[PDB]
Design a protein around this ligand. Structure first.
Ligand code: MET
Ligand code: MET
Lengths: 230, 230
């Protein structure tokens, strides 16, 4: 065997080095004994490190591909926008174990799967809603430190901006995974991302990180921006 | 012609988009009318933006290649370690126009060139010394926010650590450009960087950024770390 090293990176996220030259990361499970999506687990005593698969989570893909700005901390309040069976939300909940994760889902069937997958992760607050209409859940969602968005729609940038106006603290962060083809099927991906970046900046964000998440996702880029208001 | 856009990035650093698809950056000159190293200049009214050449400055190369953590701000106190004719120090001085740059040089001939190149940039404080002996200039160098090191020697990591112990504020940053071959001429560069990273972490740094600066420099990596003490 080779030496093994698990060290904390960012805050409450862990780099896993099995000595085989492959990059791996994990989160500390807040629900021991449960596998959310058949992820591999490294159990040390009572602590369980859930291997965070970049092939199944765009956030893990961004970290594996070089993300340097990771605003989600242990006491962070996060607004999660986007269809999910529970994969990324489960890991985000592990990270923000002293915080809250508001998960917005429109389809009851999607929420059904999310509730089953993230069962017992009590810091996740499910909210049936439409991200394009944040005013509807504004009496539920308190001001957040981070908005994480994974919505493959042409108006995804506009959605992040409106939700930021309603819920993001000044100085807070917006993380958005953008699928180029969900915006335009003709333009070159390079140009699409340039235009989307401009839209986010015009909306009030100062872009501080940008990660191409290939080969885990084709023509998808994770943008991270600090919210400065208007 | 194509549209031209100069926008601030990080703090007091500028992205220059001439509309030709090439990435360019610049700093706002604090000594108008003077070219330090025949750099190109964009003069707008009385303001002069000095194009920061990545082929001549490892710091510019790191930014061009994707650096996301840039701790040098307008009021930063910086300890600059490494031979220089004035290129990078001139730009760092432009950035930290409300701060101080302590430039340590051992050879009088090097200091001679630095003083001539950075003439009029009064926020640069030249100090003839040996970086391996920080105690000698400890009554001159006040606590700093950032240490920038460009020393191609096998003991460069040790030098950063000792200077950090003496001058770097807790929470401050260390930026070091490491030439793999100056450490070992046999080992694979990949392994050298891994070992150097470990040395820096053991020394008290939490690495928060790592930038391969090729093709501007072969087998050179810019590391950025937050100083947590011991
Ligand atoms: C389709 S559910 C798994 C992927 C989802 N985008 C997530 O990160 O949760
Ligand atoms: C040899 S002087 C120019 C390069 C130097 N390393 C600098 O950045 O100032």
């Amino acid at each position: 065997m080779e030496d093994i090293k698990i060290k904390e990176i960012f805050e409450n996220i862990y780099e896993v080095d099995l000595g085989d030259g492959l990059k791996r990361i994990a989160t500390k499970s807040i629900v021991k004994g449960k596998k959310v999506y058949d992820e591999k687990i490294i159990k040390i005593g009572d602590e369980e490190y859930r291997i965070w698969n970049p092939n199944k989570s765009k956030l893990a893909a961004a970290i594996i591909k070089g993300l340097k700005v990771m605003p989600i901390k242990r006491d962070s309040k996060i607004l999660y926008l986007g269809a999910s069976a529970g994969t990324t939300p489960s890991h985000v909940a592990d990270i923000a174990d002293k915080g809250i994760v508001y998960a917005i889902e429109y389809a009851p069937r999607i929420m059904r799967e999310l509730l089953d997958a993230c069962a017992e992760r009590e810091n996740i607050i499910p909210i049936l809603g439409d991200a394009n209409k944040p005013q509807e859940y504004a009496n539920i969602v308190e001001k957040v430190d981070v908005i994480y968005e994974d919505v493959a729609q042409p108006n995804q940038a506009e959605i992040l901006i409106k939700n930021a106006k309603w819920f993001l603290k000044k100085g807070g962060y917006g993380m958005i995974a953008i699928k180029a083809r969900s915006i335009d099927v003709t333009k070159d991906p390079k140009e699409i991302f340039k235009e989307q970046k401009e839209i986010l900046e015009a909306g009030g964000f100062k872009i501080v990180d940008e990660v191409d998440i290939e080969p885990f996702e084709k023509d998808h880029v994770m943008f991270v921006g600090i919210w400065e208001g208007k």
